[PDB]
Amino acid sequence: MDIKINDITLGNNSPFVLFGGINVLESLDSTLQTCAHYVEVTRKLGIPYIFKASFDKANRSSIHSYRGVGLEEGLKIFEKVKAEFGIPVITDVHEPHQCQPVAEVCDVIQLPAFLARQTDLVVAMAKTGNVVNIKKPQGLSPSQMKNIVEKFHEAGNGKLILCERGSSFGYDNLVVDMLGFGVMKQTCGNLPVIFDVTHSLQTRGGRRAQALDLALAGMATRLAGLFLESHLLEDFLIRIKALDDLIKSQPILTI
């Protein structure tokens, strides 16, 4: 099942969409400058692009780390990003009451992994009618994502993206099960599946050569998109796009 996001078609058999930006919104000037780098590299490679940032990050490394500019100013910034670049945007929400005003502006709203089971947030997200990105908890098996999907369906919204971020592997480590993508496709109605390579790695060419190997491996399984929590970018995306074009150009095996 494909999902239309303005002029973008997101789907497991469509060219991959890149989801990328900054961690937290600080200022309009800072945001536009970063977004302009992503936009210029992606436009030049012809890769569809969705800008990501948090306006209010509830899951911070420290208590007093900056949460972001907040709902009101954040949504202003996002409006400016959409107007200047003509691209869709994505942001996370952690409180039910935030969902509706965020959804007036943000094309995709994101369910953080740690809140993925919180029924009230699921419901309030669903009721926006917006495209939703469901982050897979590291403790949830791929065959149980269908239960989160079910709850969104009960609450009236089927425009759902499934985002892999790795699975708990002993202590501390995360491993990404390359079979999980296929399990999610088979059990969740072939909804678009995207890969958050960055998180998948935070606990493991340095990080750069690893991110590339892991992104390649995941995209080889035929996925709707790639999600980075962030010329260097350009070399990376050239390789991802090469693999993605090859894979998507071949028909799926046939019974």
Place this chain on the structure above:
Amino acid sequence: MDIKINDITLGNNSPFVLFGGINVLESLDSTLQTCAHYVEVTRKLGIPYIFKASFDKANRSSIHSYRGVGLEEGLKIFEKVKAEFGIPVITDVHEPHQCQPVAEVCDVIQLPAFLARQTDLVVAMAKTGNVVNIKKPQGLSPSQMKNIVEKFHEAGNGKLILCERGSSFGYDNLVVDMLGFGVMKQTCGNLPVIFDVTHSLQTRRAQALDLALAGMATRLAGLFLESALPLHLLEDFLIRIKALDDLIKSQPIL
């Protein structure tokens, strides 16, 4: 470090405290009846007791599932439990705004495992000044528990209980690492450590008893369970736990 909860002393070298009750509050009558059974059994065995229940089930499989009586009616029920039995009580919170009104009534407030990294909830819980029970996420190693502890300390509250509930083991399965208790004691200032045997089993009453015994053998402040154990096996179960706990606590550490 010991923590005082009314007349109870909770600590890794003190007699074990039982945190027990029901999953979700449904009615006043049901709750008082169950609580009376726990109270009568624990008082006769001489085991300190804290009554546990949730006023809300925040992650049901269905949006249409029964979720509990809710904050307002739930706190009423907890006030009645405290007035009738004179015991401390414990319940979980899911939203920052709930922390203060819950803490006015509930002696111990609990950070659910899924929310343990919701920084705003941590901060709002800490500011209550109440005793807090931190449920260890199944994806968090015992040597990183100190990071949650740090955050509570930075926000001004050192009255923290660490609650083991098992660790992710492949898909859909939990294992309890009996070495984790010691790692938590060593790295988190010997704060009280308690064992949630019930949730620790959930992926799998002979097994609860074996697992509870194993955990208490490592010398713990408390045991945390639901009744899930059938309610009339409770007295026989606790007789065995208390026997082991008395033996272990009577031997000096080294």
Place this chain on the structure above:
Amino acid sequence: MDIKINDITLGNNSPFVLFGGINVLESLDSTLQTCAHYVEVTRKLGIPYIFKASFDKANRSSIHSYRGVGLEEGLKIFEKVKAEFGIPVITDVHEPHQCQPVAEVCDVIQLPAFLARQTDLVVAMAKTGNVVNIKKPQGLSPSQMKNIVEKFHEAGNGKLILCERGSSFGYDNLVVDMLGFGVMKQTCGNLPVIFDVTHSLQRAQALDLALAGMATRLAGLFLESHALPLHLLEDFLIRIKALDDLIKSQPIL
């Protein structure tokens, strides 16, 4: 099901039996000196005792690190241990050909974990008629131990001990599932289960882990020393024995 090993009764409802000694046999004088320490401590606490060592360590940190004295000398050392102390002994075998000559001397022979699925070794061990200790591979779930058991039974030997040594937990790391004991008891005919706390561990940690395991009601404890330091042995065993006495004195629920 209990198993008789000379005058010892080994069984999940019997006082725990200590299986203890050294990693690899390196000399006669030093083996006897270590064994004497075990024997004096265990006799003083009234704990039944089986001396353990390998004559040939197959998985060494380096290729030329010493394998041990070897089969011929190793069996002579074990005969000396049995003559001097009158206690049973246990050792591992790696090759089918070694089974017979080892079993003539040793009261228990041990199937190493890495070889536990080698059908020829299983068959040759079984055919000795000896008591066998089956080391649980770290990659094998407790509900699959029954398949090793089955193969021993097909080959004619039901005098089997099951030995827990932990399970792979992510990379390079072991966790002991305290529910695995019960699963093995339930699926393998309540054969004696013992706990190798030493190999499970990679201390105050050894003691905690040993206590936790023995709290689940087991036939025995399996450990090494030099690994626990040899003079803390008595203090360690006093605590194990206290817990084991308490647990075994209560009827099963």
Place this chain on the structure above:
Amino acid sequence: MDIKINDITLGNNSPFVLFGGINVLESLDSTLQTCAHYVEVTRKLGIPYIFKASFDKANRSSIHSYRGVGLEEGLKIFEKVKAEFGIPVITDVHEPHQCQPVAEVCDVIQLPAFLARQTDLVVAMAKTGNVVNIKKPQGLSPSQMKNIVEKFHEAGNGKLILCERGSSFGYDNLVVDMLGFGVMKQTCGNLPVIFDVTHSLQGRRAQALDLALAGMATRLAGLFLELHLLEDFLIRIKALDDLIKSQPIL
């Protein structure tokens, strides 16, 4: 580091080599038939090929289960495979004494995963001088493969292939860590790394393909496995492999 196996160059920056055949040798006729299928498909796609089989099933469901033809007859069969098809072959060894006679015939000898820490087997394998395929135990981290490699080097043999076969993931289940390939390359001198996709998988055709593709996307020397299913599968692997090998490393 590349390894020459007759006319084949095996190496992490070379076209992938398929290691394929049957589980256990049963008879000359059914072995030749299966081998001929692999040979005809690989030749027609232009993929280098090494035939694999065991002469002995070391872990059998029953003591009475069929075990395979055994060393003597098994080596006869391998000689006939080499003579008829002119390809290298690979088989596993379980006992030190078997190493030399197996190595006389078999181009590559394989160290099974369960025996990978059996030092006497390591030493006897090493002393053959043959190309060795080291099966990575499901309980061993990728950063520890270097310790096995070190032992083979101390015993005088650097012609080693590292073979990924998945890692224990809870009970009774495997997962393949796609970062492990790179860790092994970086810590073990860039020795050839291959991927046993078949054993890594504790319908099923779609899974093997996804997993094989994911692994070969990390740039590997080879792939190891057991209406036209093989060819349709290898067509896709070879497409990916050609793309990945044509891009320079960064």
